[PDB]
Amino acid sequence: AMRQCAIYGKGGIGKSTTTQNLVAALAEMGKKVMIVGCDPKADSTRLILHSKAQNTIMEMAAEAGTVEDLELEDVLKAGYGGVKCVESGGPEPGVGCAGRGVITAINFLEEEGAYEDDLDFVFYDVLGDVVCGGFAMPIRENKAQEIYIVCSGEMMAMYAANNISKGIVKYANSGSVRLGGLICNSRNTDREDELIIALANKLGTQMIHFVPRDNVVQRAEIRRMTVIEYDPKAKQADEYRALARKVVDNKLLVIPNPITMDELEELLMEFGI
Amino acid sequence: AMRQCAIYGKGGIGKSTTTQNLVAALAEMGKKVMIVGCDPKADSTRLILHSKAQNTIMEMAAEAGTVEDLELEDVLKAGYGGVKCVESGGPEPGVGCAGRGVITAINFLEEEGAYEDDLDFVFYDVLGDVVCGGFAMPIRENKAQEIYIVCSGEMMAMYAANNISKGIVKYANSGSVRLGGLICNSRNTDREDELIIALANKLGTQMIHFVPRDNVVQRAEIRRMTVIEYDPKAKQADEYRALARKVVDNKLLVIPNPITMDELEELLMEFGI
Numbered sequence: 001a002m003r004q005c006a007i008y009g010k011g012g013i014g015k016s017t018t019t020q021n022l023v024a025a026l027a028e029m030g031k032k033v034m035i036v037g038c039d040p041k042a043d044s045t046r047l048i049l050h051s052k053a054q055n056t057i058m059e060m061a062a063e064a065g066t067v068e069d070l071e072l073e074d075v076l077k078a079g080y081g082g083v084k085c086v087e088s089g090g091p092e093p094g095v096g097c098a099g100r101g102v103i104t105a106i107n108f109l110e111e112e113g114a115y116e117d118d119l120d121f122v123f124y125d126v127l128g129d130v131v132c133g134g135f136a137m138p139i140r141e142n143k144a145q146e147i148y149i150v151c152s153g154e155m156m157a158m159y160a161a162n163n164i165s166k167g168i169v170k171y172a173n174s175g176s177v178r179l180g181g182l183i184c185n186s187r188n189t190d191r192e193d194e195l196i197i198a199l200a201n202k203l204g205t206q207m208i209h210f211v212p213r214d215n216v217v218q219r220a221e222i223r224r225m226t227v228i229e230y231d232p233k234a235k236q237a238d239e240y241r242a243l244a245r246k247v248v249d250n251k252l253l254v255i256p257n258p259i260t261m262d263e264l265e266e267l268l269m270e271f272g273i
Numbered sequence: 274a275m276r277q278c279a280i281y282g283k284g285g286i287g288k289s290t291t292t293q294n295l296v297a298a299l300a301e302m303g304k305k306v307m308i309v310g311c312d313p314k315a316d317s318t319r320l321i322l323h324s325k326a327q328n329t330i331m332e333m334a335a336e337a338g339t340v341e342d343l344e345l346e347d348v349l350k351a352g353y354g355g356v357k358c359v360e361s362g363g364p365e366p367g368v369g370c371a372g373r374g375v376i377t378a379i380n381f382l383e384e385e386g387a388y389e390d391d392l393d394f395v396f397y398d399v400l401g402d403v404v405c406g407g408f409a410m411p412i413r414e415n416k417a418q419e420i421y422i423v424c425s426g427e428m429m430a431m432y433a434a435n436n437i438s439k440g441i442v443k444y445a446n447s448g449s450v451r452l453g454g455l456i457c458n459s460r461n462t463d464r465e466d467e468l469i470i471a472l473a474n475k476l477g478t479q480m481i482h483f484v485p486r487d488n489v490v491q492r493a494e495i496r497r498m499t500v501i502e503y504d505p506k507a508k509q510a511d512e513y514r515a516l517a518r519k520v521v522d523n524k525l526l527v528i529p530n531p532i533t534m535d536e537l538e539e540l541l542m543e544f545g546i
């Protein structure tokens with residue numbers, strides 16, 4: 001078996017930094033992991049591959065003729081800890097549907113046998129500002145059973161978490177997609193941990209980890225690495241190791257309870273952020 | 274004539290706060306303005322209307338039967354300074370296309386004669402994390418001739434500005450949609466103004482104004498008002514008045530020059546943010 005997890009959240013909140021560092025810690029632990037980038041920014045694998053980014057399935061299919069002319073060994077690339085990496089891509093802005101590459105990529109990976117038994121985890125890194133088209137497909141089509149939402153005390157980040165939760169509820173009658181937890185990516189504000197714990201409780205889930213804001217992230221990313229690889233002794237490395245451990249051990253997967261706008265505003269008012 | 278302007282940018286960057294405060298300053302100046310909300314969050318008019326939010330065209334059409342059973346006087350609501358307000362709405366998460374309500378709303382407003390000659394400005398407040406579907410329609414279908422992008426020194430906010438610019442270039446052979454400027458909504462970081470000026474120059478536009486981060490915004494919004502209405506003597510009120518004046522006087526509308534990821538990273542590296 002393998003656990004299929006998707007990391008959702010608003011743009012800029014820390015999905016790709018958190019996912020790649022979490023996955024590096026899992027690989028350091030001995031797990032076999034694949035990352036599938038589902039964000040048109042297409043830089044969700046650069047820290048594993050030590051790269052600028054990664055050429056996308058959409059791009060490679062266009063140069064090869066069809067997606068059928070691609071081989072899995074041409075598209076999947078291995079980096080730190082043997083983590084396997086692939087990027088979906090998407091159409092250029094103003095053209096088509098921004099999420100159409102996610103559908104092409106996930107179907108290609110399934111057909112070409114990328115979901116080999118020795119994998120322990122697959123992580124999809126998914127744009128979450130809209131929940132439609134290919135960005136909704138991991139939920140609609142039962143591709144990611146465990147959704148973890150990266151957020152912060154920022155109202156827009158919590159709004160996005162509630163919006164993604166509504167999409168999970170909408171498809172609860174089919175498949176087995178569930179909310180596994182919230183990950184707080186700190187803005188270095190007071191009581192922020194308590195705020196995200198309270199939001200998780202209202203939704204029916206948990207805060208799986210509070211990730212501190214730490215400048216070592218920027219120093220590692222300037223060098224195209226995870227903190228795990230760049231400085232294994234860093235305090236922040238131990239934070240990602242704690243997050244990875246709790247994801248491995250997590251057994252709470254729920255159909256969430258989305259909240260009203262009044263509840264959100266009451267949370268922010270109360271915690272004085 | 275009326276000037277048709279759209280405010281784009283990543284989620285949470287300050288589109289709705291900036292737009293409503295800019296428009297309030299325009300109304301204080303004697304201009305007649307309409308705001309059209311084109312973001313599914315649907316709170317783009319609350320500070321003009323002193324409201325929680327505003328019921329959307331999608332919602333009202335569903336309760337009335339069809340969009341044809343709606344009258345313009347039922348949908349448009351006037352608030353501070355006589356500013357007229359309407360919200361598009363959108364489908365619930367996981368269902369349909371998140372931008373489909375924008376198409377319905379703009380077509381309804383055009384057909385029902387909302388673009389009456391005495392209007393001086395229309396502002397569309399548009400989600401900009403993806404440029405597709407209804408969110409691309411103001412550009413694709415020539416609805417907003419003047420695009421102003423709210424951003425900040427945050428890499429994701431500048432990436433979004435570049436992405437929106439690519440969509441403008443894609444439709445430059447038809448209609449007259451142009452980039453009018455960047456608005457820096459400060460994160461209170463050093464040389465941030467210089468950073469956004471440099472980005473604007475690379476794209477071929479200008480920084481039309483640097484909006485400071487000021488807690489009076491939160492104090493005004495807790496009371497469902499613009500800063501213009503809440504505290505007309507505030508320093509921040511004068512900032513929005515300066516922004517409004519420069520939008521009125523702006524004559525630079527360009528087909529922008531999108532930049533590469535290397536150029537963006539060089540900007541951040543250089544300005545040491």
Ligand SMILES: Nc1ncnc2c1ncn2[C@@H]1O[C@H](COP(=O)(O)OP(=O)(O)O)[C@@H](O)[C@H]1O
Pocket residue numbers: 009010011012013014015016017018185186211212213214215217218221428429
């Ligand atoms: N815990 C953290 N501490 C410091 N910087 C962070 C942290 N998490 C994310 N960042 C920075 O935030 C920016 C955006 O993160 P990213 O993972 O690219 O967001 P997303 O993938 O959600 O768009 C990156 O520059 C990243 O280095």
Ligand SMILES: Nc1ncnc2c1ncn2[C@@H]1O[C@H](COP(=O)(O)OP(=O)(O)O)[C@@H](O)[C@H]1O
Pocket residue numbers: 155156282283284285286287288289290291458459484485486487488490491494
């Ligand atoms: N200049 C500013 N100073 C202080 N707070 C701001 C400023 N601009 C925006 N905000 C706050 O940022 C948050 C998001 O702004 P908003 O306009 O709702 O973003 P968007 O419409 O782009 O999603 C709001 O809570 C708003 O009060």
Ligand SMILES: [Mg+2]
Pocket residue numbers: 015016017039041043044125
């Ligand atoms: Mg990312």
Ligand SMILES: [Mg+2]
Pocket residue numbers: 288289290312314316317398
């Ligand atoms: Mg808004």
